[PDB]
Design a protein around this ligand. Structure first.
Ligand SMILES: *[C@@](O)(c1nccs1)[C@H](CCCNC(=N)N)NC(=O)[C@@H]1CCN2CC[C@@](N)(Cc3ccccc3)C(=O)N12
Ligand code: NA
Ligand code: NA
Lengths: 27, 250, 10
């Protein structure tokens, strides 16, 4: 559906404070 | 969660609290996958060695929470189970193999800034992200030390290679489990701990930006011990069962 | 430690 797109983050284009740590590890 | 940190508000909108009615108390964590289905660990509902055998009546599910013990008025939705489905082949007897269950809500939950479902992976997302070295995230209201937080905790941990997983314990590992945690060497810490069970291990896809659940907090030996790792149910591997039940039962 | 919940839930 509209799964895994957070109303306070993704839907507003704001990032949570450690999500880059994740993405950075996906080489 | 050990060595984690307070979550931000709305950081994990699919995080559910399994709550015992009597005595009132946090059973485990869980997750919201649709407005009527919750994903948990089967050992959270059935574990004969500890004499744990919960029934639908026995429980309450609490969505949109941040605070471990306050009743968040105007934020959190509290529901009832219409039914519980345990994986027919869950191995409570030897190693917690197939540690997964589903719980159909009595009525659909309305989504909100604090309440939203997580995505279940597809075969290819699973293929690209389930890799040794890649980070995922665990969340829960669980112990802080091998005590409880005031708020939801979070920790990002790297997936660890199967062999490495296997040589850390005497417990038999199966293809329905993956372990996660840093090496003593990497010296950076964190693990899930008791009371985190059933909560989600999620990743964010670099392709479509969505969050997917890849694992369910299952077990460990201690917490944040060195050269040890947390074990999670592998959700992609059990997806046919998941699928099957959501189409036959509701 | 758990704060009480509204009765309609039990
Ligand atoms: C969980 O939250 C809870 N489950 C039911 C009540 S609390 C935990 C999560 C532990 C995560 N550990 C790690 N990441 N550092 N787990 C459990 O307590 C499961 C429940 C069954 N028991 C028995 C002992 C054990 N520590 C080890 C074990 C033993 C035999 C078979 C499988 C696992 C354990 O993890 N758990
Ligand atoms: Na071993
Ligand atoms: Na460890």
């Amino acid at each position: 559906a509209d799964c895994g797109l957070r109303p306070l983050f993704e839907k507003k284009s704001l990032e949570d404070k450690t999500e880059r740590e994740l993405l950075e590890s996906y080489i | 969660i050990v060595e984690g940190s307070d979550a931000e508000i709305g950081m994990s909108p699919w995080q559910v609290m399994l709550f015992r009615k009597s005595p009132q108390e946090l059973l485990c964590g869980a997750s919201l996958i649709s407005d009527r289905w919750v994903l948990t660990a089967a050992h959270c509902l059935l574990y004969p060695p500890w004499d744990k055998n919960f029934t639908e009546n026995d429980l309450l599910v609490r969505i949109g929470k941040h605070s471990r013990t306050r009743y968040e008025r105007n934020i959190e939705k509290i529901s009832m189970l219409e039914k519980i489905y345990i994986h027919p082949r869950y191995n409570w007897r030897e190693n917690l193999d197939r540690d997964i269950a589903l719980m159909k809500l009595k009525k659909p939950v309305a989504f909100s800034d604090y309440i939203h479902p997580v995505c279940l992976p597809d075969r290819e997302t699973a293929a690209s992200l389930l890799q040794a070295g890649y980070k995922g995230r665990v969340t829960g209201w669980g112990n802080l030390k091998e005590g409880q937080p005031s708020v939801l905790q979070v920790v990002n941990l790297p997936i660890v290679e199967r062999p490495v997983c296997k040589d850390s314990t005497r417990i038999r590992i199966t293809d329905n489990m993956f372990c996660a945690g840093y090496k003593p060497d990497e010296g950076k810490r964190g693990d899930a701990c008791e009371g985190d069970s059933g909560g989600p291990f999620v990743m964010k896809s670099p392709f479509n930006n969505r969050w997917y659940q890849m694992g369910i907090v299952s077990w460990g030996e201690g917490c944040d011990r060195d050269g040890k790792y947390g074990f999670y149910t592998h959700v992609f591997r059990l997806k046919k069962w998941i699928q099957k039940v959501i189409d036959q039962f509701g | 430690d758990f704060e009480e919940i509204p009765e309609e839930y039990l």
